Design a protein around this nucleic acid. Structure first.
Lengths: 86, 151, 100, 127, 112, 99
RNA sequence: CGGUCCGGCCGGGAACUCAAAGGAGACUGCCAGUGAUAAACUGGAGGAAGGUGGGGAUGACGUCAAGUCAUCAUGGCCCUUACGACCAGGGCUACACACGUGCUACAAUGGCGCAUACAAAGAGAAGCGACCUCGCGAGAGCAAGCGGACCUCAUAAAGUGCGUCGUAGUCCGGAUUGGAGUCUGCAACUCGACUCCAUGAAGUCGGAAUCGCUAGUAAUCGUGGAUCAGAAUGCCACGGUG
């Protein structure tokens, strides 16, 4: 994991989106291509349409996830079935 | 192997006693080039079985080794699935080496206290014609007469 | 290599040399433990503000004559094939066939 | 003004001086009990001395460097052999018969390219 | 010896005796003995009840048996409740760190 | 006090350089300690000469660098005038150390 | 040889270990036997060396429409609002498997705790990095010296000394998994490694059929170096034992 000296790492443009979401009026999901930005308690409740490679997937943020990267809740490749699951 | 008739490389002078046969035995026993541990183990087994027997160390080792040195082995110079086996009388040069190889093979077959104790029992009983190396030699000798149609 | 790939190397190295003065004096604040977290966080976010290929880590080592990512020698500065050609033609001083 | 002989085995250099002093041995500011680990090295570094009567007849102030334990033992053996040969000029025949004058030129072979070792090759792919 | 709900034979040393306890291992097996005033050389035999209870209290100081086991099970289930990539890899059972799972990983999976 | 170090790729171009520097020092000064050699360095390189899939076609290249050292013979002012002359033939690196 | 801070410490000593340049030196030269009165072979007085002393480089005519038009160049063919040009996020590292080349091993030839020697070859300038102190730890502040026979990387391991483990779900194997960090990198979730605690998969010598090696070679132990911000169980070389 990252050293505690530098602390959490988030995108610069992400902070502006987070601030605008909490102040004021959150109705549309926050669209971010950044997945390496750590989750903060300010984002709790708000919808994050995180890009994974094809299309932004909605993630609902709760207090359980704080010290985990936002990209963890975003599968990279679609899995249905190895034995030709039709 | 085809045109060259090799000689023989000299063996270690065996600093403890001076027995080239003992040097050959310890060289066969040692593995992975770890001479120190193998020599220590063989010396400890050397002492234990000599003091268990009572006679002189080397004078008992020679009489225990000559009692399971084989005389005739069986080989097969045939090609294909079908094979014919022919008995061949071993030369004295290979006789001691084969006996030592059988001894060291049979040594690592008992779950004793240590490798020295594993060596000691099967080294001492060879004088009385007991153990595993003598057991396999008395069957190798029977293999020659099992089918001696061609020799 | 490709013309665009070769131009990428010079475009990255130019911006890495231009911003080298800011990068070192900005990461110095982060490295200095005897500092406030309020300035540490500001330094951390300000480093991601400049363009990405502005660091020595974001550039490759394609050979000067042709351009080849895989296969390179720092001392000679060329790929393996070009180095061999130069050695056989005599362009590299004091280079012969090693045999020991 | 005492002369001496030099000896090397694989990559180790040992030079041993000969003086009339009876049996004073110290191997590079050490002794046989210090530079030890197995009786084979101690026996092999005294074979020219143990040949006829020179076990406790002249001292051995050798200092040896390089190589391993066996390499240092061989270097010391060759050095004392050469020193005794230069000292006496009549033990050379006995040393040649014992095989001590002939320096062992065998050294480690270089690692070839494509092979895992000097001669060991990678296993063929089941073909 | 009934230490933290486990039984220990009398033919072993104290280090392995503590190691046999689920959640003590090797370093704690020496730290507990050092804290209780016992060298890591004695056996289970010839062990006074005072030393037994001191060792038991030292073991109870840190985490424990099946309590710690369900301790860990809840921590693992936290990932699945989160639903992150790590939780999904736990659900699949194949990796949790992300090694080469496609060619040869026969450690958490297996046939009948 | 002062020393001169010579680095060369080949000994042919450094033996003549040492001879020239010692004869210049003999013309201007005396009491030379002789050019002392130092352990040469051999930098190796393994180049697979095949431009495609063949990990059996390798070439071993070697760069040799030989070191010579010349110390003071007579520390004066005239002896430095004849040693601060123009550089020798290209291929010999000369380093001047003073203290 | 002198003194000592007992240390090459330095005065000093240029024989040695060694440094890197030139030579001598092994050339069937000789002595016997063998052979066709030869070529050549066998043994030996000498030598560090004996028939190429031991290794490396050196790879013919040519075969395989052998492999690369994605190192590069090059003849046509193809697009010029796109097969061309820029950027963000994912994939080359992937759910039921098979195959190939290596590593750990299987244990009492062994791992474990505390002393203790023996090497060579290489790297180092926005790089190697002494010492002190915090550290159970990867490391962190402090940093001197070093473009390097000077200073570092870097008390080599095997072994050797002593106990301890007694053939055992083992003090055997460290694969999996959870907790919290240390270094480099705008940023290790997809995707590096190191460090602690715990957990302790198999395995308990492997079927047909197979791979390399004839001497400092096969095995077994450790280290350096290439590209490299970091990433070897791979590659390329030194050595220890053998």
């Amino acid at each position: 994991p990252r050293s505690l000296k530098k602390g959490p790492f988030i995108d610069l443009h992400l902070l502006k989106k987070v601030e605008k979401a909490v102040e004021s009026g959150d109705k549309k999901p926050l669209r971010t291509w950044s997945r390496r930005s750590t989750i903060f308690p300010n984002m709790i409740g708000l919808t994050i349409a995180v890009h994974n490679g094809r299309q932004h997937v909605p993630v609902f943020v709760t207090d359980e996830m704080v010290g985990h990267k936002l990209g963890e809740f975003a599968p990279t490749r679609t899995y249905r079935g190895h034995a030709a699951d039709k | 192997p085809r045109r060259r008739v090799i000689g023989q490389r000299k063996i270690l002078p065996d600093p403890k006693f001076g027995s080239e046969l003992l040097a050959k035995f310890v060289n066969i026993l040692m593995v992975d080039g770890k001479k120190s541990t193998a020599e220590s183990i063989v010396y400890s087994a050397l002492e234990t079985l000599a003091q268990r027997s009572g006679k002189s160390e080397l004078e008992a080792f020679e009489v225990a080794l000559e009692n399971v040195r084989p005389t005739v082995e069986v080989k097969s110079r045939r090609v294909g699935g079908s094979t014919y086996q022919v008995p061949v009388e071993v030369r004295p040069v290979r006789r001691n080496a084969l006996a030592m190889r059988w001894i060291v093979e049979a040594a690592r077959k008992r779950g004793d206290k240590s490798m020295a104790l594993r060596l000691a029992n099967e080294l001492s009983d060879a004088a009385e014609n007991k153990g595993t190396a003598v057991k396999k030699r008395e069957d190798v000798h029977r293999m020659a007469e099992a089918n001696k149609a061609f020799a | 290599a490709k013309q665009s790939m070769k131009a990428r190397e010079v475009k990255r190295v130019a911006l890495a040399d231009k911003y080298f003065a800011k990068r070192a004096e900005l990461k110095a604040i982060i490295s200095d433990v005897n500092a406030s977290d309020e300035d540490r966080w500001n330094a951390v976010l300000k480093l991601q503000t400049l363009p990405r290929d502005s660091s020595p880590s974001r550039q490759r080592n394609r050979c000067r004559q042709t351009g080849r990512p895989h296969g390179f020698l720092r001392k000679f500065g060329l790929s393996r094939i070009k180095v061999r050609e130069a050695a056989m033609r005599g362009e590299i001083p004091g280079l012969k066939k090693a045999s020991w | 003004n005492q002369y001496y002989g030099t000896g090397r085995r694989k990559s180790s250099a040992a030079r041993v001086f000969i003086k009339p002093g009876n049996g004073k041995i110290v191997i590079n500011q050490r002794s046989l009990e210090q530079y030890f680990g197995r009786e084979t090295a101690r026996m092999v570094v005294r074979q020219p001395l143990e040949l006829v009567d020179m076990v406790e007849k002249l001292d051995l102030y050798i200092t040896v460097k390089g190589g391993g334990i066996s390499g240092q033992a061989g270097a010391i053996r060759h050095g004392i052999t050469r020193a005794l040969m230069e000292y006496d000029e009549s033990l050379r025949s006995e040393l040649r018969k014992a095989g001590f004058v002939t320096r062992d030129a065998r050294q480690v072979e270089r690692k070839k390219v494509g092979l895992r070792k000097a001669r060991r090759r990678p296993q063929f792919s089941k073909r | 010896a009934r230490i933290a709900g486990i039984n220990i034979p009398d033919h072993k040393h104290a280090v392995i005796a503590l190691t046999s306890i689920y959640g003590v291992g090797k370093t704690r097996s020496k730290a507990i003995l050092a804290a209780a005033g016992i060298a890591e050389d004695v056996k289970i035999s010839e062990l006074s009840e005072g030393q037994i209870d001191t060792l038991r209290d030292e073991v109870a100081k840190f985490v424990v048996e099946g309590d710690l086991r369900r301790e860990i099970s809840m921590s693992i289930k936290r990932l699945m409740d989160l639903g992150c990539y790590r939780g999904l890899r736990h659900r699949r059972g194949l990796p949790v760190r992300g090694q080469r799972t496609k060619t040869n990983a026969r450690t958490r999976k297996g046939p009948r | 006090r002062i020393r001169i170090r010579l680095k060369a790729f080949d000994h042919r171009l450094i033996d003549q350089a040492t001879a020239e520097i010692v004869e210049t020092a003999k013309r201007t000064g005396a009491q030379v300690r002789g050019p002392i050699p130092l352990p040469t360095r051999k930098e190796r390189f393994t180049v697979l000469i095949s431009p495609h899939v063949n990990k059996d076609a390798r070439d071993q290249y070697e760069i040799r660098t030989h070191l010579r050292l010349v110390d003071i013979v007579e520390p004066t002012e005239k002896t430095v005038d004849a040693l601060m002359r123009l550089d020798l033939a290209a291929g010999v690196d000369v380093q001047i150390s003073l203290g």
